[PDB]
């Protein structure tokens, strides 16, 4: 089990390093964009020409590498927590036998150690673990919210905001109130940053709540 998980860790590290190194080495320019250095470190793209240039700047490479870093750290922490969970309870056989397949990881670690956490508050009452259950759902919500900025792109929101602006400029009583800044949709790079921030915050909060609630409700 340690062999397989260590190779998974090697995978995460190699892929994260590949993304970061590729972005750093191709930051000055590539075949698709020979003069990338003239556009700076961060820029939305280079237009839909030449087949498409979405996520071509070095900033975008770092952006894509943050996901892989979170995944690698998640694998590392999952391994450490499960091994120590079995060691603290004097049952190394659980990890020695269930870590060789993914179903053991999902059933004997995630589903098994989440009973007390999700029971912090229920239709019967609440205990000191309710804060961790609320933080668990909070992290899930932030992560899913980030999925919006990650999947939806700037175009749909610009038209929607234009429609909203028309509605405000034509609604009586509310016409007396005006906006000092023209409302516009988030920038492409700004949207990627907001989505990444939400993803990372939800990831960290969810794992922190689960980790503390699982190792605290038992010991």
């Amino acid at each position: 089990g340690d062999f397989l998980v260590h190779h998974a860790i090697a995978l995460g590290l190699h892929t994260t390093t590949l993304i970061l190194v590729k972005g750093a080495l191709d930051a000055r320019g590539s075949k698709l964009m020979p003069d990338k250095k003239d556009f700076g470190y961060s820029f939305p793209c280079d237009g839909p020409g030449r087949g498409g240039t979405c996520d071509i700047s070095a900033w975008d490479a770092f952006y894509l590498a943050v996901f892989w870093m979170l995944n690698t750290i998640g694998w590392v922490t999952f391994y450490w927590h499960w091994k120590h969970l079995g060691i603290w309870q004097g049952n190394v056989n659980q990890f020695n036998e269930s870590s060789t397949y993914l179903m053991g990881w999902l059933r004997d670690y995630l589903w098994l150690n989440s009973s007390q956490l999700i029971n912090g508050y229920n239709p019967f009452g609440m205990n000191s673990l309710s804060v961790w259950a609320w933080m668990f759902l909070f992290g899930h919500l932030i992560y899913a919210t980030g999925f919006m900025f990650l999947i939806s792109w700037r175009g749909y929101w610009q038209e929607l905001i234009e429609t909203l602006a028309w509605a405000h400029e034509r609604t009586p009583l509310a016409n007396l109130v005006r906006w000092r800044d023209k409302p516009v949709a988030l920038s492409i790079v700004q949207a990627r940053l907001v989505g990444l921030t939400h993803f990372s915050v939800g990831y960290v909060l969810t794992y922190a709540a689960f980790l503390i609630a699982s190792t605290s409700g038992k010991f």
Binding site: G125, M126, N127, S128, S130, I212, S216
Partner: protein, 73 residues
């Protein structure tokens, strides 16, 4: 916690939340505190206990010293 480092849960800080209900206030009282508190999880208790700190006066003195150091910086 110094007297019983294995049978007492460290306290991080107090909790003053007007939204708390009676069951929440009673459920967050643990390490012999007067009211709802948060159980420490950063390990500052073990570190401070290992470096020689033993009373609350020493911790307060260290906090004041760090405050003066921050102002100096």
């Amino acid at each position: 916690w110094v007297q019983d480092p294995l049978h007492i849960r460290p306290i991080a800080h107090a909790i003053w939340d007007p939204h708390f209900g009676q069951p929440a206030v009673e459920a967050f009282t643990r390490g012999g505190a007067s009211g709802p508190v948060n159980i420490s999880t950063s390990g500052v208790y073990q570190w401070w206990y290992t470096i020689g700190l033993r009373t609350n006066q020493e911790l307060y003195t260290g906090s004041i010293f760090l405050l003066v150091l921050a102002a100096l910086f």
